Ligand binder design. Structure first.
Ligand code: CA
Ligand code: ZN
Ligand code: ZN
Ligand code: ZN
Ligand code: ZN
Ligand code: ZN
Ligand code: ZN
Ligand code: ZN
Ligand code: ZN
Ligand code: ZN
Ligand code: ZN
Ligand code: ZN
Ligand code: ZN
Ligand code: ZN
Ligand code: ZN
Ligand code: ZN
Ligand code: ZN
Ligand code: ZN
Length: 298
């Protein structure tokens, strides 16, 4: 027949990242066949010998919604053959955006007399694909319409002139969506009127240290965010065993080893459970978090 079975083949965007690179060889039914493209294609040239070469550096986003380099070839040696070539192009960078806001869950405060269009928090997601653009939006507003999000910047801004209530929680569920390839999870943003307690940069902390850890060496750094941007004082208590084995820097949040350790001494536990407290001298507010320290033998 005049038409050959359609050549189907899969390559990544990156396989086509260099002009003139021979991606694949089109097969010939007879030794003396020569190839020629039917229509000029922006992405590929076809050599006389059937080698398919990168013309313009492949860009998945720039392909039609089909995501294929789709072209025909003429085969000869008139009595000529025709064959369709469909290169399915895979965008291997195309993985969903994720929020890079820290700490999670998303927490902000709103000034009680915040005037309209006061920014209270900036949503920041990252698309691992550098070639993608994302839009931020609210999927569920539990604030009674007191906040909106800028789709470009991710900035969350107050609306209306009414006051906000002290200690009152305003909740938005927010999402960033890809304009190319997927989205973030629908994350919960908690905005509290006026002030709220410090939030640790991790919901729990875990350290693993050898038996021979040097006395007064740093074991783990703990940090809490003060929403009032006020001074944080850290304290550390032991849950059960190990009181006084570790301390934490009042200002630094750095947990050091206070005592020598013996793994073969069964008086000392192998897993220490500690609670770190972050205290604002901004008045009252404290938050606690678990710190778990495991000791390995050496
Ligand atoms: Ca791309
Ligand atoms: Zn036939
Ligand atoms: Zn591009
Ligand atoms: Zn891409
Ligand atoms: Zn990956
Ligand atoms: Zn890319
Ligand atoms: Zn949009
Ligand atoms: Zn804007
Ligand atoms: Zn009102
Ligand atoms: Zn949903
Ligand atoms: Zn240090
Ligand atoms: Zn500051
Ligand atoms: Zn500090
Ligand atoms: Zn030992
Ligand atoms: Zn002992
Ligand atoms: Zn606990
Ligand atoms: Zn041992
Ligand atoms: Zn040993």
């Amino acid at each position: 027949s005049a038409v050959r079975p359609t050549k189907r083949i899969e390559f990544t965007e990156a396989d086509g990242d260099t002009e003139g690179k021979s991606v694949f060889q089109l097969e010939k039914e007879t030794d003396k066949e020569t190839f020629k493209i039917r229509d000029d294609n922006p992405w590929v040239t076809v050599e006389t010998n059937g080698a398919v070469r990168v013309k313009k550096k492949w860009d998945y986003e720039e392909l039609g919604p089909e995501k294929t380099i789709d072209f025909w070839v003429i085969i000869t040696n008139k009595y000529t053959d025709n064959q369709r070539v469909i290169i399915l192009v895979k965008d291997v960078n195309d993985e969903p955006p994720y929020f890079i806001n820290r700490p999670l869950p998303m927490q902000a405060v709103v000034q009680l007399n915040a005037p309209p269009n006061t920014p209270v928090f900036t949503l920041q997601a990252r698309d691992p694909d550098t070639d993608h653009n994302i839009h931020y939006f609210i999927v569920r507003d539990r604030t009674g319409g007191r906040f909106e999000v800028d789709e470009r910047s991710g900035v969350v801004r107050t609306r209306g002139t009414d006051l906000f209530q002290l200690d009152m929680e305003y909740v938005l569920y927010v999402k960033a969506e890809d304009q190319n390839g997927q989205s973030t999870p629908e994350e919960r943003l908690s905005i509290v009127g006026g002030k709220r307690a410090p939030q640790f940069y991790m919901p729990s902390y875990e350290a693993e240290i050898p038996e021979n850890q040097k006395k007064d060496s740093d074991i783990i750094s703990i940090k809490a965010k003060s929403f009032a941007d006020r001074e944080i004082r850290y304290t550390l208590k032991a849950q059960g065993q190990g009181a006084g084995t570790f301390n934490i820097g009042p200002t630094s949040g750095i947990v050091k080893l206070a005592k020598e350790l013996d793994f073969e001494d069964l008086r000392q536990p192998h897993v220490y459970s500690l609670i770190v407290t972050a205290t604002e001298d901004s008045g009252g507010f404290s938050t606690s978090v678990d710190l778990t320290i495991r000791v390995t033998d050496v």
